[PDB]
Amino acid sequence: ARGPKKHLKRLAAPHHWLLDKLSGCYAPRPSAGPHKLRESLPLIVFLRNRLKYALNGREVKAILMQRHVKVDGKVRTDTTYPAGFMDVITLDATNENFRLVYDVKGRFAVHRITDEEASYKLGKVKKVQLGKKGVPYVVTHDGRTIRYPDPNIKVNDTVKIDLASGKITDFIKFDAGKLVYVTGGRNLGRIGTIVHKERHDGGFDLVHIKDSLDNTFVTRLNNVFVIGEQGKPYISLPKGKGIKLSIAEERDRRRAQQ
Amino acid sequence: GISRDSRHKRSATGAKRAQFRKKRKFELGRQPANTKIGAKRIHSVRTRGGNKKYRALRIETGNFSWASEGISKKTRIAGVVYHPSNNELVRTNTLTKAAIVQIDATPFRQWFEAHYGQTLGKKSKNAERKWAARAASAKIESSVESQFSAGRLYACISSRPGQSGRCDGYILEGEELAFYLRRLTAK
Amino acid sequence: ELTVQSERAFQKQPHIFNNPKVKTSKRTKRWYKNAGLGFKTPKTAIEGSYIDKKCPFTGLVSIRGKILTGTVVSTKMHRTIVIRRAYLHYIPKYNRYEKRHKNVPVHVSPAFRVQVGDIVTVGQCRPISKTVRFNVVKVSAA
Amino acid sequence: MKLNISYPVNGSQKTFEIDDEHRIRVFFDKRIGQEVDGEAVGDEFKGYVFKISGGND
RNA sequence: UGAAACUGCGAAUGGCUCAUUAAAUCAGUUAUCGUUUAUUUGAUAGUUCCUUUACUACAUGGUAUAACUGUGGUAAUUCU
RNA sequence: GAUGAUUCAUAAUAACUUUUCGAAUCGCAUGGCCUUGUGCUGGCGAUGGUUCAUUCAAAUUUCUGCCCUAUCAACUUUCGAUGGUAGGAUAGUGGCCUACCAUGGUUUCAACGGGUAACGGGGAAUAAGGGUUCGAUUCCGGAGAGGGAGCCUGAGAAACG
Numbered sequence A: 001a002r003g004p005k006k007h008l009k010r011l012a013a014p015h016h017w018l019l020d021k022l023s024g025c026y027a028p029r030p031s032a033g034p035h036k037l038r039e040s041l042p043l044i045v046f047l048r049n050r051l052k053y054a055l056n057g058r059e060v061k062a063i064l065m066q067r068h069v070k071v072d073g074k075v076r077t078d079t080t081y082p083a084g085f086m087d088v089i090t091l092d093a094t095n096e097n098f099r100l101v102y103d104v105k106g107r108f109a110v111h112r113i114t115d116e117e118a119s120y121k122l123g124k125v126k127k128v129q130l131g132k133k134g135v136p137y138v139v140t141h142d143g144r145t146i147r148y149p150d151p152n153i154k155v156n157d158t159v160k161i162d163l164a165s166g167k168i169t170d171f172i173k174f175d176a177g178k179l180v181y182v183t184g185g186r187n188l189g190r191i192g193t194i195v196h197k198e199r200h201d202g203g204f205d206l207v208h209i210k211d212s213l214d215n216t217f218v219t220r221l222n223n224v225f226v227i228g229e230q231g232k233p234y235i236s237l238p239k240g241k242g243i244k245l246s247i248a249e250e251r252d253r254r255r256a257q258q
Numbered sequence B: 001g002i003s004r005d006s007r008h009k010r011s012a013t014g015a016k017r018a019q020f021r022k023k024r025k026f027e028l029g030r031q032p033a034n035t036k037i038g039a040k041r042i043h044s045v046r047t048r049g050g051n052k053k054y055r056a057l058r059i060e061t062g063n064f065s066w067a068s069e070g071i072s073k074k075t076r077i078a079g080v081v082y083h084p085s086n087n088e089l090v091r092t093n094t095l096t097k098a099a100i101v102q103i104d105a106t107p108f109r110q111w112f113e114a115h116y117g118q119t120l121g122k123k124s125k126n127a128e129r130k131w132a133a134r135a136a137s138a139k140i141e142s143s144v145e146s147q148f149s150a151g152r153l154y155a156c157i158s159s160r161p162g163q164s165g166r167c168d169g170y171i172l173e174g175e176e177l178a179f180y181l182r183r184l185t186a187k
Numbered sequence C: 001e002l003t004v005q006s007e008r009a010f011q012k013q014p015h016i017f018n019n020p021k022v023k024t025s026k027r028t029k030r031w032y033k034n035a036g037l038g039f040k041t042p043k044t045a046i047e048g049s050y051i052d053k054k055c056p057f058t059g060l061v062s063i064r065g066k067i068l069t070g071t072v073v074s075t076k077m078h079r080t081i082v083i084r085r086a087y088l089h090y091i092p093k094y095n096r097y098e099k100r101h102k103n104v105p106v107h108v109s110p111a112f113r114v115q116v117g118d119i120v121t122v123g124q125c126r127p128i129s130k131t132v133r134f135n136v137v138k139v140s141a142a
Numbered sequence D: 001m002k003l004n005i006s007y008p009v010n011g012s013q014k015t016f017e018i019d020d021e022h023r024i025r026v027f028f029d030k031r032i033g034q035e036v037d038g039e040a041v042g043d044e045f046k047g048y049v050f051k052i053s054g055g056n057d
Numbered sequence E: 001u002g003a004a005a006c007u008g009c010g011a012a013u014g015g016c017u018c019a020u021u022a023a024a025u026c027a028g029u030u031a032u033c034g035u036u037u038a039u040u041u042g043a044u045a046g047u048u049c050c051u052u053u054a055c056u057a058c059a060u061g062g063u064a065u066a067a068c069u070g071u072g073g074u075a076a077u078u079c080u
Numbered sequence F: 001g002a003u004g005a006u007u008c009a010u011a012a013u014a015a016c017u018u019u020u021c022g023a024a025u026c027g028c029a030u031g032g033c034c035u036u037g038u039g040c041u042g043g044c045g046a047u048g049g050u051u052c053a054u055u056c057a058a059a060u061u062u063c064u065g066c067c068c069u070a071u072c073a074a075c076u077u078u079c080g081a082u083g084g085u086a087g088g089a090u091a092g093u094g095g096c097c098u099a100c101c102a103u104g105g106u107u108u109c110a111a112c113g114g115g116u117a118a119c120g121g122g123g124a125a126u127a128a129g130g131g132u133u134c135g136a137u138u139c140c141g142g143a144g145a146g147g148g149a150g151c152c153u154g155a156g157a158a159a160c161g
């Protein structure tokens, strides 16, 4: 009531952060930023719970204030800054470069990338319109506004964003035979090529998708992120490559390496 | 104070609701402006999210548009002659939207002379070229031009004075003029 | 359908201005739109003279949200009817169903003529009145 | 009563206890800002003029 | 370095309880093409010499007022 | 250009304004080029600021779903009850309120009334299967601050440290 909430209890935090239910009543509430607080990862939980570079939030603040970490090339000395999908995170001490991509279990992965790849990111366009004085713009999935885009860029395409400038390098359209990333829903983390999309005028366009082992599935168009053509992706995929082995095959694979 | 909610009314079945909640602020309502004529007096209202709102009380002039002629002039308001919601607003001379008023009409006749060179009712070469070129558009209508002989035009208020502060309008024309004329001349 | 101009105000579509200077055929500018979702705009809306601010075709409302179907049980309001949606409600203990129903007040345009017993389909709009949130988009029975 | 008197030019101020109530009775029925003459209240205050600026009851 | 005080933010979150409340709350599912939104993040403002040859300050214009200093009232208050 | 769909985005014209905003702000670094004046020029920030988008939200809202009771069968409607037209008010939609008009709206498929030792849900206990009883209480939503009503400030309160 009476205004915006500022706390976030543990057991209400998103489950993919993997915060243990003991050791505290509260979870780090993500501050307002480029990503929605459910589909986000604060820098405190990334630096402490995923990389183990700190033991406390106090140590995460001590890391942040000497301007070590920067996210998408900007410094961001904020504890609960929402780092989201496709953000690059640079740790100049250790010269490390991460990209936030999902593993197939549905959680954010520690995906180390090279220094050439940290110079860009992909963004899914959410709307194209005309701003004031008739200047067109696009809005990517992390809320970046890019003026004077290519006229061929319609919605649900991916644009390659330069991250030194905010300029657009190239772009991938939306049709059949395109490599997609599922970000959202039950199938979160899977990679498959799009076979066809269902019109459904009035709400919730569906799209059918099959992975490399020929397992089909279907997803709403809200959760699909095109990442290239079949064969080459435009980014480096994490380990596993979005395959979704069943639990039978998973314990068989674990009993191989054990 | 004045509440804007629906929980205080009966249900569609007709039952009396119980008092679920005290009156919240995001459902408030405010007293009316009742904008009179003369000696301009604009108060401010602080509304939701900052977002100032101008209660005009007692407005004097207005910007009125001639739609067939594509112009608009700042004209003085004489008085309200008709209101479809209430006759007491016509009597008390309140200015709301959709009020039929009388306006001064002298800027419109000055523009009509300066634009077309013919006078309504009853020198340089450049002006002669301009006035000759836009000929066969200086024959507006009978009803409006008879008002121009009488120096008072019938206008309709298209703005909301209690909300914006301004009392804007358009000159009545055509079938809408004939409708309100039958309303006015009705005994 | 005997006069248009019945009220004390002048009934007209907003911002649709007919220029008194010109003289053509096609007597008045009438604004109409297609409501979408495959509903056909009726010819009585396109050619008629009624004003009907809350019309899904000539008026200022938009259809978005649920599309429902009912049977007309009342026409005694003015430009408003009450439809009856009948459904079966399942009770898990006894493993069977029961007949239930709701009454939905919907707005009906003068493009459409309904009587009691007609089946209609309605589209959700913004709140029209205290109870009305739905608007007739196709009458296709008798 | 007592008189909290300030000379604002020189910037000094000093209180004076006044007795003989029918000498302060010239002060009565007068406003803040209204001026009163000095020789009514006191022969030390001869020729002077005071403005009533306030007080506490 | 740093009290006070002014300015700016915050005090609408949190914590407590379960009186009211029976299509109300609530739950799942929709909508805003029917609206407000501090903050965050990304974009974004050559046009104002208001009578526009100076009527002038734009290598930078006017008042306060607090804290402070001093004189006080009330039995008493986070009074003044 | 977009949408299933708009009088949408955006652009243009004519005016309006009681005239909004369009940096008289702060910290480090102190370079560059000269006809050498305390000349011109220039880095990384901090705070502010109009509009749009974003995020954190909010307010309304669609469909369906609630315990016992007929020793509750008719209820609502001059004082809005159901709808229509205009206005007003609101952040906005709407009987939300007003003016005029029409006579509607709910109900045995249980309306309306009464009772609840009734905050709702995730859930708990006990169960072969089906069920029955509970849920003030670790999370989510609501409400309240002795009882009522009114309001200031603010983006956000009908706020109770």
Ligand SMILES: [Mg+2]
Pocket (backbone or CB within 6 Å): A028, A029, A030, A031, A080
């Ligand atoms: Mg936080």
Ligand SMILES: [Mg+2]
Pocket (backbone or CB within 6 Å): A001
């Ligand atoms: Mg709280």
Ligand SMILES: [Mg+2]
Pocket (backbone or CB within 6 Å): none
């Ligand atoms: Mg910004």
Ligand SMILES: [Mg+2]
Pocket (backbone or CB within 6 Å): none
């Ligand atoms: Mg209305």
Ligand SMILES: [Mg+2]
Pocket (backbone or CB within 6 Å): none
């Ligand atoms: Mg009405």
Ligand SMILES: [Mg+2]
Pocket (backbone or CB within 6 Å): F118
């Ligand atoms: Mg109780």
Ligand SMILES: [Mg+2]
Pocket (backbone or CB within 6 Å): F136
């Ligand atoms: Mg109790």
Ligand SMILES: [Mg+2]
Pocket (backbone or CB within 6 Å): none
């Ligand atoms: Mg709670």
Ligand SMILES: [Mg+2]
Pocket (backbone or CB within 6 Å): A001
């Ligand atoms: Mg409260």
Ligand SMILES: [Mg+2]
Pocket (backbone or CB within 6 Å): F146
């Ligand atoms: Mg008590």
Ligand SMILES: [Mg+2]
Pocket (backbone or CB within 6 Å): F160
């Ligand atoms: Mg209170």
Ligand SMILES: [Mg+2]
Pocket (backbone or CB within 6 Å): F161
């Ligand atoms: Mg207390």
